[PDB]
Amino acid sequence: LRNVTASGVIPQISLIMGPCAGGAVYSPALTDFTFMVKDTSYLFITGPDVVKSVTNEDVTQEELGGAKTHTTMSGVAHRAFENDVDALCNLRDFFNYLPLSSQDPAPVRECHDPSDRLVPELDTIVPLESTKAYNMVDIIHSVVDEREFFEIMPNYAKNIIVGFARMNGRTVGIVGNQPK
């Protein structure tokens, strides 16, 4: 009830850093972003013991609810980090993008990257041949402040790119196609 009531009022970020089973698995489904830790975290409703008892299929813990599955195939986890220390270091930097409440404007932070500089690197990225693909990420990185881009779900639905960045100090969200 609190997780639903808070939606659209304050952002809710969940990082899973271990096993998760039973009813606990639904709070990350109510929060705004879910992150995991590679090969350390799991997210499943029932364990492999129940699965084998119900249906005649064999599965292990990493296959049933591992971080790799949820970031690559089910589309549940937004990003997995290598270990506990790196996960919290990246979480602090992610935190700096978001407002404290929906009543606040997007955060604006000191920026040294001139807002009026040209980017000649863009003029020749897109090929003239219609059947030649190119990497959209080169455009995203060259536009955003100081070439810093926070990519969400890098390994799921690779044909569309979403993430956070800053332009002239202000947090923006970026969505684009990936012709590659």
């Binding site: 220390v85 990246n90 932070r109 690197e121 003029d123 059947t131 990185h141």
Partner: protein, 668 residues
Amino acid sequence: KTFDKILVANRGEIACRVIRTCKKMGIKTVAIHSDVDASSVHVKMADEAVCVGPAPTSKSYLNMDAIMEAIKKTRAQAVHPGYGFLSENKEFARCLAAEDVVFIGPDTHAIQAMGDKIESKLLAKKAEVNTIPGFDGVVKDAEEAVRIAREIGYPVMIKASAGGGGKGMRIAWDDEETRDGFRLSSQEAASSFGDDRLLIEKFIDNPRHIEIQVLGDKHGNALWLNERECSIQRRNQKVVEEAPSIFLDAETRRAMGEQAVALARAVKYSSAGTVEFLVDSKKNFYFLEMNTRLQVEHPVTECITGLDLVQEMIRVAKGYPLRHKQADIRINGWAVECRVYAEDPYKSFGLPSIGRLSQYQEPLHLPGVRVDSGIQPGSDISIYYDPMISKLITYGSDRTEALKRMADALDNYVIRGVTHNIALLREVIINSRFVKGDISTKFLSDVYPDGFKGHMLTKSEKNQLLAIASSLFVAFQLRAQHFQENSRMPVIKPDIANWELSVKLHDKVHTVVASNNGSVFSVEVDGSKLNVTSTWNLASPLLSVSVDGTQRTVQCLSREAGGNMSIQFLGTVYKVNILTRLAAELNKFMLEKVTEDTSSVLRSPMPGVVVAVSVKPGDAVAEGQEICVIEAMKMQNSMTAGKTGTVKSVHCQAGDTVGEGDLLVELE
């Protein structure tokens, strides 16, 4: 006065050089390009351009018939091919002259005259240069090997009458090992390729490669310019040259300059070219070869002679005499040039890389620096062309000023998107043997006998790098705390008195404590006090810092939340992992998991039909190299290699249909 329109038959910085000179002269310049070079710099700088052909040079820059069509289509009057492609192609010059188009470069007589080694040696004998005699006969006896050497000279080489690769070769100086070397080769060589006939000739020790440039005149005149020292090289290609050598005094320069002219005036070389000499440790100069074409080492002599070689070549081709006399040619200072390639210097000294350029900034704000480049940001470098990025030229009044300015230009020279060779250039120019001048044509092979490793830091340099890396780390952490004022939720700046960091370099973990006092960070690195002062503009690719009065320029190439930071320091990229004291103490509890590098196994990322395979087993593969091309849903998808190696097997061929995950090619 001069030509109205000149066509250039080349690409890149050499085409740019001609375009700039023509514009200075008021001459319209026509460029040619391939389909992939259509956006290159020289195409945009030229006044008119014609597309000749596709990406491979054999069909675009060596296609003389398509070029002839472009020459007449634009009503060009003269052609300047630069170097490389068709500069020595006689059939091109013949069919070009047949159409009364002025060719800028050698005529076909000079190209054929030096076509082979026999005519070149005969010219050196006639022009009277050197070409030291050997033994015009076969040595058969045990005493002939020494008796003949006694008549001609001292350092004597014994080699097979025909063959190579150590086919009984030995180096001898005195008579005892000359006799021994011959009889060993004459009795064992018969067991290799069935031939035991030995010849003797004369050799030199620690050679230096020295060039002298000559400007020919159609009226019979010819002048010689200051020499070039070209000893720093890899894979028989030069990388660093110096103009005002060091191995010559005023008399030697005149003596050798006159001989280089004697060669040019005896074949009537009414063009610009180069004569190559080898000098031994005793300052004895021997003829090596005569070159007919503007060299790639012509932008370093100009900085001390004050000439413009392209401007002069165009007037001579029009029919004007040389504008100078020999008494006016002098050394006005010193100039050194470094060639920058898109190559990995670690992989057997210069393995080509493939890629696109994302950041590029030439050091043109520094004094005495001239950058001659054919690229612009958003340029691609590919396997079809020699991976040249630029030639960096630095000059000064003395030898130390030109070298110091070169060191500065290299650290302020931003190349990102490809692998480059700046680390190698930055270390060689500061090598104690290079500064003193004890350089031979095999210099790099003795300095780096196990390959290039990178710049090695000393005690004071490690402390400066740790102080810079730690202060920059904190500078980012402080910038992160400066928010606009939120009237609803006031932000309170953490009152951090000291930053206690654990800084991991190669295999050591150092203790660094930093504090901020405005623009200066007071940093203690394992008990050593350093003060790092800067403006700390975190967006610029070039960060200028002052560490205890020492001026440094560094580049931050990457930064991660996990503490990883890549800093280029003195040309070499160092990987430093900066954790806070707390993170470092807890990080010891993390499992040291080991993963697998699966970059040699190339699988299909997408179902569809394979339409091209660029390889067969044994083919060399660079990182980023296209291997296979799969086309599904009206879209050509290139599959590239993630590893430098060779192909072991091609598992799917063109015409085969593959699914997701199927194995296409296997690399070593």
